[PDB]
Design a protein around this ligand. Structure first.
Ligand SMILES: C[C@H]1[C@@H]2C[C@@H](O)/C=C/C=C/C=C/C=C/C[C@@H](C)OC(=O)C[C@H](O)/C=C/C[C@H](O)C[C@](O)(C[C@@H]1O)O2
Ligand SMILES: C[C@H]1[C@@H]2C[C@@H](O)/C=C/C=C/C=C/C=C/C[C@@H](C)OC(=O)C[C@H](O)/C=C/C[C@H](O)C[C@](O)(C[C@@H]1O)O2
Lengths: 276, 276
């Protein structure tokens, strides 16, 4: 609930936010990219001291447990799934995972497969040998889907399901299908109290993680998959997909679905989860 | 004498300095450029509240007074000419000028002519109607030379002289004549106590000011000009130049000439100044 410190005048955050405010998206992006390129990398998860650590956000008797993956945004983190987890308090366990590289002097993944890999392992630590559902908002969805598929292919472990909260793509290829530019504006122009500053490490991590979306290795997971679509933004999956993929609509936008319209989203997730 | 705070881990300074340490010059440069592009600009000196303000570094009876122009470096500023001015203490007045845009929420010049212009005006405030010599170390030299010429052409005011301390070029065109990359390393790897952090405003200002070197409008000044060359780095000007230009050698490198070998440099400046 407590606000992080406001951005200073000379801060990267402010310069960044001012650039978005004044519609200078490409320039802001190029700064991020140039900054992100200086960050040090890691190629294997063994080169990591410890794996990112999960935050428990709700506890409960059970069903499958919910493991949420943070969005690769500079203001992202475990706190992003707290309202959502509030609707599950006392019913089931809900964790969230930070992404590696957003905390100062964490190295970033060197490659998209390493990125998927670290999310997958850290998802496993969080499962603690239980049966789990991977959740991911927006592009965290893409990392959740693909981490499910990596778990299946290389460790023969299988989530009960994967939930995508308005995930718009996997690779997020910049190609006119969606205003990616306007979505970035809207995200960072959302008006709420964040518990984190957009540090230089978090902004450079965002660039690196977002930059890897375009080069992700696409891989199928057989486990069931729920896409909750947000109706305020506005028959592709059947028997021929090779696995069940359901699409539910929610009366919410992309942002409101994990915020004020979160309890709807949670309930659509509950309904679906037990109908499995 | 007191050290500025050390760079934090997440600071632009550290990431920047680490990039230079590990020989990743182009990448460091690209970050600087991308950052510098977000800074706001100004096209006229009238759009400025106040002009940069001079710091008096030595006082004295007189001769021509010495006005030093700071180097467009992130750790630059009036303090750069303090050792030099120490050798002139009690003999003549020595000021230094900050460059606009290095202090947080100063705007940068929009164009190289504005850059020259602001240096020229701020040089004038510092002259206080007296007779003066413009001094400039390295690339500050280029701005000093050209500001002399702007003073001459548009206000008919004429420095007594211009002194260039190992200035290597005017436009500093990246073109194999000199290791610009290795000179940037060496500058920032110099080991001394700075009284300033390389803030984000100072690093973005450096990019913008350095970036404008390549597009400067070259213009002659008629006033006499001394180039002190540094011998540890290792007949072009005569009657056909159209004005007197002298080249003296000093037993010093590019950095040592304003540091430990400063009193030599000062004395070469004294000798020359009175032989006019
Ligand atoms: C150099 C990289 C560059 C890195 C950097 O320049 C861009 C950073 C963009 C950050 C966008 C943040 C948006 C967050 C809002 C969130 C809802 O969208 C998202 O969660 C996903 C977001 O819309 C998609 C981002 C993909 C990047 O836009 C792809 C790319 O340009 C590919 C390029 O190869 O990233
Ligand atoms: C995008 C710009 C870029 C801006 C940014 O990418 C470069 C910053 C470079 C900073 C260098 C600092 C060196 C300081 C040492 C000092 C002794 O050298 C100097 O006082 C002068 C220094 O060697 C010359 C710098 C000229 C720039 O190197 C020219 C340029 O690449 C032209 C290009 O159009 O600057």
């Amino acid at each position: 609930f407590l606000p992080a410190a406001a951005p200073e005048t000379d801060s990267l955050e402010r310069m960044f936010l001012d650039a978005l405010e004044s519609g200078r998206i490409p320039e802001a992006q190029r700064m991020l990219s140039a900054l992100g390129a200086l960050r040090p990398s890691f190629e294997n998860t063994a080169e990591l001291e410890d794996l990112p650590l999960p935050a428990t956000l709700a506890e409960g008797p059970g069903a499958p447990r919910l493991i949420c993956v943070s969005t690769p945004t500079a203001n992202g983190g475990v706190h992003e799934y707290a309202r959502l987890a509030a609707s599950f308090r006392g019913e089931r366990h809900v964790s969230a995972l930070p992404l590696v590289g957003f905390a100062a002097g964490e190295r970033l993944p060197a490659t998209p497969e390493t990125a998927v890999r670290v999310v997958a392992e850290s998802t496993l630590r969080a499962s603690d040998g239980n049966p789990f559902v991977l959740v991911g908002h927006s592009s965290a969805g893409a990392f959740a889907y693909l981490a499910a598929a990596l778990l299946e292919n290389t460790w023969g472990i299988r989530p009960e399901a994967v939930v995508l909260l308005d995930t718009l793509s996997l690779r997020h290829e910049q190609n006119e299908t969606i205003d990616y530019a306007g979505l970035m504006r809207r995200h960072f122009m959302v008006d709420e109290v964040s518990p984190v500053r957009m540090t230089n490490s978090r902004l450079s991590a965002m660039a690196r993680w977002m930059g890897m979306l375009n080069q992700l290795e696409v891989r199928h997971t057989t486990v069931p998959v729920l896409i909750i679509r947000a109706a305020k933004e506005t028959g592709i999956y059947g028997e021929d997909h090779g696995s069940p993929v359901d699409v539910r609509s929610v009366d919410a936008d992309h942002f409101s679905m994990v915020r004020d319209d979160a309890p709807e989203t949670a309930r659509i997730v509950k309904e679906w989860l037990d109908s499995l």
